[PDB]
Symmetry: C2
Subunit: 243 residues, 2 copies
């Protein structure tokens, strides 16, 4: 692939060289390898989380009694695990022969933690089997170990899917890059009060922006549209996970 | 125990003798054995099922697609199974030595089916592990087999708890009899719209009457009051089963 021509940046003013941590360099390589290997499409959707939010906030007592903080992330992890089982092509990878998908029968999900040294994506194993306060505890632990460089490379392996949440900082939507060999990554941005037509008038609903990027070789437009539609449906009423 | 004196009923008018099925006679014996063995207390509670009802009715599409009818019974079975795990003394039996409780580490629940021949209480095994549409399917099957005399005595065994629902016929509450060696039975009656004080005014909420009878040798008043309070809490918001 043609390289970018070097420029003498100091011809234009003062420059300074800072170096990249080995973590950034690793990260840089993996993103570039994914970019050139995966033809990316991003499907955008918004989910009504007004009732989910009310639930979160009411269970503040129980979560503190348990010592966990219950954010949107365990609710997101539980719903994507239910969906990764319903729509199995999202829980799979392209076999190196280019002619088979390896469908995984397990659901481990990674989530992006941005640390000073670079991006880490710890993996919670068997998300489909853990409860909201279990995933809350564990997500929190893995993030603290990630920040404190105590995350062992074992916990960075064998994910089937990645959630990347930037809702705590800002933004309306973004187009994340698939962590190949996974086949999809869910970006989540900031929730806002939005007018939503109730058939007769506009009601304020709290809306969560979702950005699903996927590997278009494995997932086609209709399948990905159906995945963010079911996810918006499960987040609007998380009780559907019970049936 | 002193017998009831025989009366010549025909001195007062015409009488007719109909016989009891063997099922009624079995049933008659077991109830009398429980009655004389278990000092019974009934704890009454009401649960707000307005939102549960809305959920039931909205999932009518999914349940029909699955071929199951989703009544209140699978929702009741799922919540009592979660609770039978939280409050383990309800999931136990008095050991024959009179000095130990056998705590069961499994949750199988029976439910009363009134058939022409008599009462049958089929048992769904491992209710804690099945989903609302799974319990819906299975409850329906077991009831049809019960009515059609095809219920094998295997499926009438090893229950930990019994739900007896008469909400489809009527009534405000009743005092059910514990099926010893179990230690409790939940009676459920008809839901009604009821005014419920919202701090400022009376709001109509749909209220489900619950009647928990228990074996007072094993369960004391505070524990049973806490059990129907948690059950009313879980039925008012079934999402708490997710955490």
């Amino acid at each position: 692939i043609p390289p970018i021509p070097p420029v003498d940046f100091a011809k234009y003013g003062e420059i300074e060289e800072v170096p990249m941590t080995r973590l950034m360099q690793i990260g840089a390589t993996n993103l570039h390898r994914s970019w050139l290997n995966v033809p990316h499409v991003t499907q955008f959707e918004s989910a009504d989380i007004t009732e989910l939010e009310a639930f979160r906030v009411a269970q503040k007592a129980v979560a503190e009694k348990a010592g966990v903080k219950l954010t949107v992330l365990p609710l997101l992890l539980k719903a994507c695990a239910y969906l990764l089982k319903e729509l199995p092509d999202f829980n799979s990878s392209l076999a190196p022969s280019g002619q088979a998908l390896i469908r995984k029968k397990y659901v481990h999900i990674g989530f992006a933690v941005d640390t000073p040294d670079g991006l880490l994506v710890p993996v919670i194993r068997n998300v489909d089997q853990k409860s909201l306060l279990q995933l809350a505890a564990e997500a929190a632990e893995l993030a603290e170990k990630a920040r404190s460089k105590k995350l062992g490379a074992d916990a960075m392996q064998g994910a089937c899917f990645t959630i990347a949440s930037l809702g705590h900082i800002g933004g309306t939507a973004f187009t994340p890059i698939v962590n190949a060999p996974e086949v999809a990554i869910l970006g989540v941005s900031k929730a806002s009060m939005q007018p939503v037509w109730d058939g007769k008038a506009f009601q304020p609903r709290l809306m969560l922006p979702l950005s699903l990027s996927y590997d278009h070789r494995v997932i086609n437009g209709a399948a990905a549209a159906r995945f963010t539609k079911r996810l918006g449906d499960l987040l609007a009423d998380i009780r559907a996970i019970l049936l």
